[PDB]
Write a protein that binds this ligand. Structure first.
Ligand SMILES: [Cl-]
Lengths: 353, 21
């Protein structure tokens, strides 16, 4: 098999990892195990550390400096790989012992445990004129050489490797998303009934979503238009809290429901990125560098507020209803319904991306 | 202050062999 490696500019340090993507199984996350090869020909600093960092990267809205970003830490963990800690006595992973067997005594292991309730790797979509690193939430392993943790890290005496915390679709599909609502109007005795359902609860990226729509219009009013939309809900809990609902797919059917009649139709929508590139800030799955990634997968939670960006998706079905009559155009008569669903990648039967 | 960064300087991420056991 193969492994990843990356060296410091001066070659003095070389980080080895088994993989870049670490799976959050909700109950537990894959541990970040690796080794650090230290070249004694160039080492003098007498202490090599490794650090796991979950950070929110962002640009300042008030600064006009191209490519300028900042990283605010949400989670930091450290391990002193060199020299081996006098207190710490921990078992090696198989990957680690294989790496030691290959590299020799100069390779010192590091193992980070990612606690639950940490944000998954999410990148917010940049605008056409962004030249800096990808903004959002990302993980990073940084191995460096210093006298102590206070020391200002020389970039040449260090090496960073971007890693991602990811989640995959649950093996067992949830209950079929259905939703209904009944609107009774002022001047009408009979109600306007809206029923909607999706074909399933779990969808994969690039997969069609089928919205079964059934309207029972027993009122005097008229449904003029039916708007279907796939909306991305993003909750961003960081310094303060922000939220948005961004439509990532939509269809405006001129389907009309006459008074005292029923209507039934299946609408099919597929969320994809190509027609959403102008929407800066849109949530995407975490990037290693600047390579394309899909619309951000749904975040799977367990059982309060979580740092970072939490993504979810809902289908909205909206009936635009005629007005007029007693209250003229003052009172809205529209009728909507919402259907939450899960948008994720299938669990890899073979290899990571 | 909050660590600033000027994105476009690092070695390209490599890849080595690992024998089976
Ligand atoms: Cl969830």
């Amino acid at each position: 098999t193969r492994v990843f490696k990356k060296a410091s500019p001066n070659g003095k340090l070389t980080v080895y990892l088994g993989k870049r993507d670490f799976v959050d199984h909700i109950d537990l996350v894959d541990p970040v195990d690796g080794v650090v090869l230290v070249d004694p020909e160039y080492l003098k600093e007498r202490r090599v550390y490794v650090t796991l960092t979950c950070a929110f990267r962002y640009g300042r809205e008030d600064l006009d400096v191209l490519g300028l970003t900042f990283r605010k830490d949400l989670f930091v963990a450290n391990v002193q790989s060199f020299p081996p800690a006098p207190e710490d006595k921990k078992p090696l992973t198989r990957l680690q012992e294989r790496l030691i067997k290959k590299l020799g005594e100069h390779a010192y292991p590091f193992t980070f445990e990612i606690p639950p309730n940490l944000p998954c790797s999410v990148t917010l979509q940049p605008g056409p004129e962004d030249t800096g690193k990808a903004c959002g939430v990302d993980y990073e392993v940084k191995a460096f050489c210093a006298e102590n943790l206070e020391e200002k890290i020389h970039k040449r005496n260090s090496v960073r490797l971007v890693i991602r915390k990811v989640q995959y679709a649950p093996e067992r599909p949830g209950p079929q998303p259905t939703a209904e609502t009944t609107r009774q109007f002022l001047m009408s005795d009979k109600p306007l009934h809206l029923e909607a359902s999706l074909d399933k609860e779990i969808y994969y990226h690039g997969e069609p979503i089928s919205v079964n729509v059934h309207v029972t219009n027993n009122t005097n009013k008229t449904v003029k238009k039916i708007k279907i939309s796939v909306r991305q809900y993003a909750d961003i809990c960081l310094f303060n809290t922000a939220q948005y609902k961004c439509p990532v797919a939509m269809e405006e059917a001129d389907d009309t429901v006459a008074p005292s009649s029923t209507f039934c139709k299946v609408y099919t929508l597929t969320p994809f990125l190509a027609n959403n590139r102008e929407k800066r800030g849109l949530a995407l799955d975490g990037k290693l560098k600047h390579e394309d990634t899909n619309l951000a997968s749904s975040t799977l939670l367990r059982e309060r507020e979580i740092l970072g960006i939490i993504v979810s998706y809902k289908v909205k079905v909206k009936l635009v209803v005629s007005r007029g009559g007693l209250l003229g155009d003052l009172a809205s008569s529209d009728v909507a319904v919402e259907l939450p669903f899960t948008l994720m990648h299938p669990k890899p039967k073979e290899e990571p991306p | 202050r909050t660590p600033p960064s000027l994105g476009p300087e690092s070695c390209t991420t490599a890849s080595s062999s690992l024998a089976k056991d």
